[PDB]
Design a protein around this ligand. Structure first.
Ligand SMILES: Cn1c(=O)n(CCC(C)(C)O)c2cc(Nc3ccnc(Cl)c3C#N)ccc21
Ligand SMILES: Cn1c(=O)n(CCC(C)(C)O)c2cc(Nc3ccnc(Cl)c3C#N)ccc21
Lengths: 131, 131
């Protein structure tokens, strides 16, 4: 059964939020309604501003700025590792974080810069486990 | 714990999709980055095209149309009940469907028109339970 009686007596759909996220990632894959390019060193990443703002304190701050909300192109700090950014952008659209020994330092540094609290906390816990 | 080992060995965040959806509904409440007005009889509803497309076959068809993707205003069939539309728009952004005896017929008719398969199926099952 795809639904249940919510605590607030509303009927709630168990998979709805994940199904919505899957469809926003399908739109991204197909470059449909993307409205920003994120530039990380040479690399460019197309995305939807609303997804970026929902997942990151930095993007939230940028796209609620009266001057910056109208930018089609956002350049990140050139010290940001593009692979670390790619792993975090994928996480934003999937809930899945591809954390590995070889990328955890870049992923954590990028997540700190993007203000992605849950990811930063998770990276710290995985680093602490070694240690 | 907010994460787990996914089936594909990625670390997966249990609440991420629901947290993203909550933030998109906060953006909607605050009228931030909304890019379309849906007109239903007299009533106007501001939304994000990407959320509408993710939840509805009709909005998906409209906003992937090369001519219609560029419309800031979408008028629905004037036979559509605004309360039924409001309940479905709220559902899109929350996973919560406020189905009641007094609104189920309007909700189902609107969901059929919007091509929201899971909601239609759910309405049919609740109607069948009476009957
Ligand atoms: C520090 N930080 C986060 O870690 N995250 C990620 C939250 C989580 C749980 C998704 O992972 C954030 C999302 C936002 N975005 C919003 C916050 C409040 N209100 C609105 Cl409208 C928005 C939007 N859009 C802001 C800051 C953040
Ligand atoms: C009939 N129908 C639905 O019931 N729904 C709602 C699915 C559910 C599970 C959310 O409830 C639909 C979403 C879409 N949207 C997409 C489908 C495929 N690919 C992409 Cl990119 C999109 C987008 N955006 C299309 C048709 C639909």
């Amino acid at each position: 059964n795809l639904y249940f009686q919510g605590a607030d007596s509303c009927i709630q759909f168990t998979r709805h939020a994940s199904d919505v996220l899957l469809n926003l990632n399908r739109l991204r894959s197909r470059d449909i309604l993307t409205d920003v390019v994120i530039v990380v060193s040479r690399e460019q990443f197309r995305a939807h501003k609303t997804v970026l703002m929902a997942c990151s304190g930095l993007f939230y701050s940028i796209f609620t700025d009266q001057l910056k909300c109208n930018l089609s192109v956002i350049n990140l700090d050139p010290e940001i590792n593009p692979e670390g950014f790619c792993i975090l952008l994928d996480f934003m659209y999937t809930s899945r974080l591809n954390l590995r020994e070889g990328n955890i330092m870049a992923v954590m540094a990028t997540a700190m810069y993007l203000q992605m609290e849950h990811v930063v906390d998770t990276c710290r816990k995985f680093i602490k486990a070694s240690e």
